Amino acid sequence: SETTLLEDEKSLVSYLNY
Amino acid sequence: SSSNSEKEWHIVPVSKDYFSIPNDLLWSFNTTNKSINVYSKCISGKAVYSFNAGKFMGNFNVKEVDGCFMDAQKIAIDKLFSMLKDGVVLKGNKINDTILIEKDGEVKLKLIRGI
């Protein structure tokens, strides 16, 4: 969502589970 | 969506106070059980992560040797571990594929040397 983001669990894992 | 961890994020010291951070710490957000997992050659840490205004936190339960994080490195690690708990926000500049650790209006740590 952002340059890195991960300010939400969902957005965090959505970025991690890539 | 929420279950993909065991992903080695090599932590990077950005700020000058963290220049003493140890040999190499492996950071992995455990998104499968939703807990912070930080481990290395000599440290073993679990935590539960919470969010406040985008600030990513984690109450840790680390077990760790002394000497392997020398002294100042262990301090570095306390520094780093206290950061999350104070609320570290993942984000930075010129990055789109790498995680960065920032708190108090500046980055002092990273996940991977993306930048």
XYZ file of N, CA and C in Angstrom:
399
model
N 0.836 -1.198 0.000
C 0.000 0.000 0.000
C 0.874 1.251 0.000
N 1.978 1.172 0.725
C 2.884 2.297 0.887
C 4.304 1.870 0.502
N 5.266 2.777 0.658
C 6.677 2.506 0.418
C 7.079 1.182 1.074
N 6.566 0.967 2.267
C 6.702 -0.295 2.944
C 5.373 -0.647 3.579
N 4.878 0.298 4.371
C 3.623 0.171 5.084
C 3.753 -0.845 6.204
N 2.651 -1.533 6.507
C 2.585 -2.518 7.592
C 2.214 -1.822 8.882
N 1.164 -1.030 8.769
C 0.600 -0.301 9.891
C -0.692 -0.965 10.326
N -1.059 -1.980 9.570
C -2.207 -2.819 9.868
C -1.742 -4.249 9.772
N -2.323 -5.157 10.534
C -1.900 -6.544 10.464
C -2.115 -7.077 9.050
N -3.314 -6.859 8.533
C -3.672 -7.300 7.194
C -2.704 -6.750 6.154
N -2.389 -5.462 6.244
C -1.514 -4.815 5.273
C -0.066 -5.231 5.504
N 0.184 -5.743 6.693
C 1.506 -6.149 7.106
C 1.779 -7.509 6.506
N 0.828 -8.402 6.707
C 0.950 -9.751 6.206
C 0.736 -9.792 4.713
N -0.121 -8.917 4.196
C -0.324 -8.799 2.755
C 0.980 -8.435 2.067
N 1.878 -7.890 2.854
C 3.169 -7.461 2.378
C 4.210 -8.532 2.665
N 3.972 -9.298 3.720
C 4.862 -10.380 4.122
C 4.586 -11.687 3.385
N 3.312 -12.005 3.185
C 2.927 -13.283 2.577
C 3.077 -13.242 1.058
N 3.667 -12.161 0.566
C 3.902 -11.972 -0.860
C 4.645 -13.172 -1.452
N -4.123 -15.351 3.946
C -3.370 -14.078 3.926
C -2.457 -13.969 5.148
N -3.004 -14.226 6.330
C -2.246 -14.088 7.565
C -1.667 -15.430 8.014
N -0.622 -15.877 7.321
C 0.120 -17.075 7.708
C 1.289 -17.320 6.760
N 2.308 -16.482 6.867
C 3.529 -16.657 6.094
C 4.686 -15.983 6.814
N 5.437 -16.776 7.560
C 6.556 -16.269 8.326
C 7.835 -17.010 7.932
N 8.706 -17.244 8.923
C 9.988 -17.891 8.736
C 10.749 -17.285 7.568
N 10.607 -15.984 7.444
C 11.203 -15.233 6.379
C 12.296 -14.325 6.930
N 13.541 -14.677 6.626
C 14.704 -14.026 7.220
C 14.824 -12.564 6.801
N 14.437 -11.664 7.687
C 14.724 -10.258 7.495
C 16.000 -9.917 8.255
N 17.095 -9.724 7.540
C 18.348 -9.335 8.181
C 18.249 -7.897 8.660
N 18.285 -7.705 9.968
C 18.086 -6.383 10.542
C 19.291 -5.485 10.290
N 19.001 -4.235 9.973
C 20.020 -3.252 9.650
C 19.958 -2.074 10.610
N 21.098 -1.655 11.170
C 21.169 -0.470 12.009
C 21.324 0.798 11.174
N 20.370 1.707 11.301
C 20.415 2.960 10.561
C 20.996 4.075 11.423
N 20.453 4.218 12.622
C 20.848 5.296 13.512
C 22.133 4.950 14.243
N 22.814 6.000 14.677
C 24.187 5.931 15.141
C 24.286 5.157 16.447
N 23.205 5.170 17.213
C 23.176 4.510 18.514
C 23.041 3.001 18.346
N 22.625 2.578 17.155
C 22.412 1.163 16.874
C 23.554 0.596 16.049
N 24.599 1.379 15.851
C 25.749 0.906 15.083
C 26.426 -0.283 15.766
N 26.077 -0.533 17.023
C 26.686 -1.602 17.778
C 25.882 -2.904 17.695
N 24.770 -2.906 16.952
C 23.920 -4.101 16.842
C 24.754 -5.308 16.382
N 24.504 -6.491 16.988
C 25.327 -7.707 16.838
C 25.648 -8.177 15.423
N 26.340 -9.316 15.390
C 26.770 -9.983 14.164
C 25.691 -9.949 13.085
N 24.486 -10.372 13.454
C 23.371 -10.462 12.518
C 22.172 -11.088 13.203
N 21.118 -10.314 13.319
C 19.877 -10.791 13.901
C 18.872 -11.107 12.809
N 18.181 -12.223 12.956
C 17.152 -12.591 12.000
C 15.787 -12.203 12.536
N 15.140 -11.306 11.830
C 13.801 -10.883 12.170
C 12.802 -11.607 11.281
N 11.751 -12.124 11.876
C 10.669 -12.711 11.119
C 9.352 -12.454 11.830
N 8.478 -11.676 11.212
C 7.151 -11.511 11.765
C 6.423 -12.829 11.609
N 5.992 -13.414 12.702
C 5.205 -14.624 12.621
C 3.765 -14.225 12.405
N 3.343 -14.245 11.163
C 2.011 -13.802 10.800
C 1.030 -14.959 10.852
N 1.572 -16.143 11.074
C 0.801 -17.358 11.112
C 0.173 -17.539 12.497
N 0.931 -17.182 13.528
C 0.431 -17.189 14.900
C 0.255 -15.748 15.377
N 0.692 -14.838 14.512
C 0.699 -13.402 14.766
C 1.484 -13.057 16.036
N 2.798 -13.169 15.919
C 3.733 -12.888 16.999
C 5.056 -12.433 16.382
N 5.848 -11.658 17.105
C 7.154 -11.269 16.594
C 8.150 -12.374 16.908
N 8.900 -12.806 15.914
C 9.947 -13.785 16.136
C 11.291 -13.207 15.727
N 12.158 -12.999 16.701
C 13.478 -12.457 16.432
C 14.524 -13.395 16.994
N 15.308 -13.985 16.120
C 16.277 -14.976 16.534
C 17.560 -14.852 15.736
N 18.645 -15.262 16.347
C 19.941 -15.253 15.706
C 20.771 -16.388 16.268
N 22.050 -16.387 15.937
C 22.994 -17.378 16.431
C 22.859 -17.578 17.940
N 22.566 -16.494 18.646
C 22.615 -16.513 20.108
C 21.370 -15.930 20.808
N 20.347 -15.506 20.068
C 19.156 -14.920 20.707
C 17.874 -15.568 20.190
N 16.884 -15.655 21.064
C 15.629 -16.332 20.769
C 14.467 -15.540 21.350
N 13.735 -14.838 20.501
C 12.705 -13.960 21.000
C 11.364 -14.134 20.340
N 10.348 -14.267 21.168
C 8.983 -14.207 20.718
C 8.372 -12.919 21.239
N 7.326 -12.455 20.597
C 6.626 -11.267 21.041
C 5.227 -11.265 20.474
N 4.344 -10.479 21.046
C 3.046 -10.260 20.439
C 2.997 -8.836 19.941
N 2.580 -8.655 18.707
C 2.620 -7.338 18.109
C 1.257 -6.672 18.105
N 1.279 -5.382 18.383
C 0.084 -4.567 18.433
C 0.313 -3.310 17.603
N -0.757 -2.632 17.226
C -0.640 -1.448 16.388
C -1.302 -0.246 17.040
N -0.626 0.890 16.980
C -1.183 2.136 17.481
C -0.798 3.283 16.559
N -1.779 3.815 15.834
C -1.552 4.918 14.898
C -0.486 4.559 13.860
N -0.500 3.310 13.412
C 0.463 2.861 12.430
C 1.758 2.382 13.053
N 1.918 2.618 14.344
C 3.106 2.177 15.046
C 3.015 0.694 15.377
N 3.977 -0.059 14.875
C 4.041 -1.492 15.087
C 4.864 -1.800 16.331
N 4.243 -2.493 17.270
C 4.867 -2.785 18.548
C 4.977 -4.277 18.774
N 5.651 -4.662 19.847
C 5.788 -6.066 20.164
C 6.309 -6.298 21.560
N 5.498 -6.903 22.413
C 5.945 -7.236 23.760
C 6.747 -8.524 23.718
N 8.031 -8.425 24.031
C 8.969 -9.511 23.781
C 9.168 -10.418 24.973
N 9.549 -11.632 24.645
C 9.963 -12.631 25.604
C 11.233 -13.282 25.095
N 12.314 -12.527 25.095
C 13.553 -12.993 24.496
C 14.411 -13.710 25.516
N 15.060 -14.758 25.057
C 16.108 -15.412 25.809
C 17.394 -15.253 25.022
N 18.474 -14.913 25.692
C 19.671 -14.520 24.981
C 20.930 -14.633 25.836
N 22.012 -14.995 25.167
C 23.317 -15.139 25.776
C 23.960 -13.777 25.996
N 24.946 -13.734 26.850
C 25.759 -12.541 27.006
C 27.159 -12.819 26.502
N 27.731 -11.844 25.823
C 29.021 -12.042 25.196
C 28.916 -12.174 23.685
N 27.831 -12.782 23.212
C 27.643 -13.003 21.777
C 27.114 -11.731 21.152
N 26.343 -11.007 21.940
C 25.954 -9.654 21.599
C 26.890 -8.719 22.353
N 28.110 -9.215 22.583
C 29.115 -8.546 23.397
C 28.488 -7.825 24.586
N 28.535 -6.502 24.571
C 27.884 -5.705 25.598
C 27.064 -4.614 24.958
N 27.677 -3.911 24.023
C 27.049 -2.765 23.411
C 26.067 -3.220 22.357
N 26.310 -4.411 21.847
C 25.434 -5.019 20.869
C 24.140 -5.437 21.541
N 24.275 -5.960 22.749
C 23.124 -6.313 23.561
C 22.322 -5.061 23.901
N 23.026 -4.005 24.290
C 22.423 -2.687 24.430
C 21.700 -2.282 23.148
N 22.379 -2.448 22.012
C 21.791 -2.187 20.697
C 20.484 -2.945 20.520
N 20.472 -4.159 21.029
C 19.340 -5.051 20.894
C 18.216 -4.643 21.827
N 18.583 -4.181 23.011
C 17.608 -3.616 23.934
C 17.006 -2.375 23.310
N 17.890 -1.550 22.762
C 17.500 -0.359 22.021
C 16.492 -0.708 20.929
N 16.836 -1.703 20.113
C 15.990 -2.128 19.009
C 14.675 -2.702 19.520
N 14.749 -3.569 20.515
C 13.561 -4.221 21.043
C 12.635 -3.237 21.745
N 13.203 -2.210 22.350
C 12.412 -1.171 22.984
C 11.741 -0.302 21.920
N 12.382 -0.188 20.758
C 11.837 0.599 19.651
C 10.466 0.106 19.233
N 10.353 -1.199 18.966
C 9.083 -1.766 18.524
C 8.035 -1.459 19.562
N 8.418 -1.664 20.806
C 7.515 -1.528 21.926
C 7.089 -0.079 22.122
N 7.932 0.852 21.693
C 7.591 2.264 21.770
C 6.732 2.622 20.579
N 6.826 1.765 19.589
C 6.032 1.890 18.399
C 6.884 2.210 17.196
N 7.359 1.178 16.521
C 8.169 1.358 15.341
C 7.293 1.189 14.106
N 7.397 2.105 13.173
C 6.595 2.037 11.977
C 7.438 1.610 10.783
N 6.957 0.580 10.117
C 7.594 0.035 8.933
C 7.241 0.923 7.740
N 8.270 1.421 7.036
C 8.133 2.445 5.990
C 9.446 3.211 5.868
N 9.613 3.912 4.765
C 10.791 4.729 4.579
C 10.699 5.556 3.320
N 11.790 5.624 2.579
C 11.814 6.366 1.330
C 12.538 5.563 0.265
N 12.063 5.677 -0.974
C 12.717 5.058 -2.127
C 12.715 3.526 -2.016
N 11.812 2.993 -1.212
C 11.697 1.554 -1.067
C 10.286 1.110 -1.449
N 10.171 -0.044 -2.094
C 8.859 -0.584 -2.456
C 8.807 -2.092 -2.254
N 9.902 -2.664 -1.775
C 10.013 -4.118 -1.669
C 10.762 -4.543 -0.414
N 11.087 -3.587 0.435
C 11.874 -3.865 1.623
C 11.299 -3.126 2.834
N 11.431 -3.732 4.007
C 10.829 -3.202 5.220
C 11.838 -2.374 6.002
N 11.387 -1.265 6.564
C 12.276 -0.362 7.278
C 11.686 -0.018 8.640
N 12.546 0.081 9.639
C 12.117 0.271 11.029
C 12.395 1.698 11.517
N 11.334 2.448 11.787
C 11.457 3.839 12.164
C 10.609 4.144 13.404
N 11.133 4.958 14.312
C 10.347 5.461 15.438
C 10.944 6.777 15.930
N 10.062 7.712 16.292
C 10.447 9.074 16.693
C 10.860 9.921 15.496
N 10.228 9.669 14.355
C 10.417 10.524 13.195
C 11.702 10.253 12.439
N 12.251 9.061 12.601
C 13.446 8.667 11.867
C 13.608 7.160 11.896
N 14.234 6.648 10.863
C 14.538 5.233 10.775
C 15.842 4.956 11.507
N 15.846 3.921 12.318
C 17.041 3.555 13.058
C 17.363 2.085 12.858
N 16.484 1.392 12.154
C 16.654 -0.019 11.892
C 15.966 -0.371 10.576
N 16.318 -1.493 9.970
C 15.629 -1.944 8.764
C 15.494 -3.454 8.761
N 14.557 -3.949 7.969
C 14.503 -5.358 7.643
C 15.025 -5.520 6.232
N 16.220 -6.101 6.121
C 16.955 -6.210 4.869
C 17.588 -4.866 4.493
N 18.705 -4.926 3.779
C 19.374 -3.723 3.308
C 18.833 -3.307 1.934
N 17.525 -3.086 1.862
C 16.902 -2.681 0.610
C 17.426 -1.360 0.097
N 17.489 -0.404 0.990
C 18.043 0.896 0.697
C 19.484 0.981 1.193
